[PDB]
Amino acid sequence: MKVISFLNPKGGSGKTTAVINIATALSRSGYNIAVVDTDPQMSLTNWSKAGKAAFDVFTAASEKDVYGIRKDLADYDFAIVDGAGSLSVITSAAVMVSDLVIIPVTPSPLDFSAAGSVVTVLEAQAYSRKVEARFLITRKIEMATMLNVLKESIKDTGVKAFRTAITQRQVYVKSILDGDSVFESSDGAAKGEIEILTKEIVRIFE
Numbered sequence: 540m541k542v543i544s545f546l547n548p549k550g551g552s553g554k555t556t557a558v559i560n561i562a563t564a565l566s567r568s569g570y571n572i573a574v575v576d577t578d579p580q581m582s583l584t585n586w587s588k589a590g591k592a593a594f595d596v597f598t599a600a601s602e603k604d605v606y607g608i609r610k611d612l613a614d615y616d617f618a619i620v621d622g623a624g625s626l627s628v629i630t631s632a633a634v635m636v637s638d639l640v641i642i643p644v645t646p647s648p649l650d651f652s653a654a655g656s657v658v659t660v661l662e663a664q665a666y667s668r669k670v671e672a673r674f675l676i677t678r679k680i681e682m683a684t685m686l687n688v689l690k691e692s693i694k695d696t697g698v699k700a701f702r703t704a705i706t707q708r709q710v711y712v713k714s715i716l717d718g719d720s721v722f723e724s725s726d727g728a729a730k731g732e733i734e735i736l737t738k739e740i741v742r743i744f745e
């Protein structure tokens with residue numbers, strides 16, 4: 540089993556949106572997926588109350604639930620962790636049990652510092668214990684042609700970003716409100732980037 544966490548204390552960085560759609564993409568590909576919500580607000584948990592998730596959902600009530608992830612979800616192929624809104628104990632717990640940490644970050648030059656705070660935690664571990672990490676660019680508006688500012692900031696951390704960025708689309712907002720994913724919509728563009736993005740994630744473990 541492999542553990543993937545989507546971490547960034549910054550609210551609205553796209554963690555939950557990414558988790559739902561990527562978890563769905565993985566399930567569609569034949570993987571056995573479990574998603575663990577560690578957010579006190581339980582956005583993902585509530586979303587799953589509609590009962591339309593193509594994967595199993597779990598709600599971490601404390602850091603202890605995150606520690607036992609490798610034992611409790613050993614039967615799954617991937618356990619995907621949806622992050623919280625602060626660099627608390629629950630966040631550190633997520634880092635420690637992860638095989639891969641994905642840092643959703645938008646092109647906002649003012650909000651990059653939040654994503655960088657997660658890198659600081661990751662960079663604290665020894666090389667022999669270093670967790671694999673990637674930036675995932677999210678909420679990128681369609682008219683964006685070249686994000687050199689974001690590129691420089693990312694380059695400065697040393698952590699690589701996925702090639703595929705999650706674009707800003709209302710379908711991402713509507714689907715979650717209906718308790719579904721983009722794979723239940725008619726937006727073929729949204730489904731496309733999520734599919735290619737997922738392939739990149741998989742390739743990391745293959």
Ligand SMILES: Nc1ncnc2c1ncn2[C@@H]1O[C@H](COP(=O)(O)OP(=O)(O)O)[C@@H](O)[C@H]1O
Nearest residue numbers: 550551552553554555556678706707708711712
């Ligand atoms: N790719 C996107 N396209 C359009 N709106 C988005 C996108 N990602 C996030 N949002 C909007 O911003 C909110 C924050 O996303 P959410 O996944 O809950 O973030 P985190 O999980 O960062 O708090 C959503 O409820 C939605 O309104």
Ligand SMILES: [Mg+2]
Nearest residue numbers: 554555578582
């Ligand atoms: Mg969230």
